[PDB]
Amino acid sequence: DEKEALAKLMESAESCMPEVGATDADLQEMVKKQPASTYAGKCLRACVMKNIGILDANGKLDTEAGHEKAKQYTGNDPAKLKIALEIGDTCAAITVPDDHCEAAEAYGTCFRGEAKKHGLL
Incomplete structure (x- = not known):
């Protein structure tokens, strides 16, 4: 069901993409739980978190x-x-x-960091 949670996040992220001009590469970094390598990807993440x-x-x-x-x-x-x-x-x-x-993104860094420490990765 964590799978389904990530699926919901990606739908949200898909509807957020055009308003921050993010790309498919930005979306892929998110699903893979990586740092955002672009500013738009950081803004994509803000748009999802705000939702x-x-x-x-x-x-x-x-x-x-x-x-x-x-x-x-x-x-x-x-x-x-x-x-x-x-x-x-x-x-x-x-x-x-x-x-x-x-x-x-600074929150996301913390999330990923703690998630790795606590075995959620």
Whole structure:
């Protein structure tokens, strides 16, 4: 069901692509959970996160409504889901830039980092 979570993210990312002029290469970096190698890809990620609501209108992480948010990353599984919740609390504390595109990617770095540490990768 984590698979299905990634599938939802990609649909969202597909509808976000034209408004930040992102490319298929940018989309592929996302599915593969890599850093964004372009600014548009960072903005693509901001657009997705904002649609999830994990990133708010002032470009800061919003961890309220925990389950609804974290399940968009890991699916419904309890052990996984719990870890994502903890990753949210960890990463909501980092310092990020005022630029929302760059802020989304600094959060994404934290997400991936913690996910590797906790075995979600």
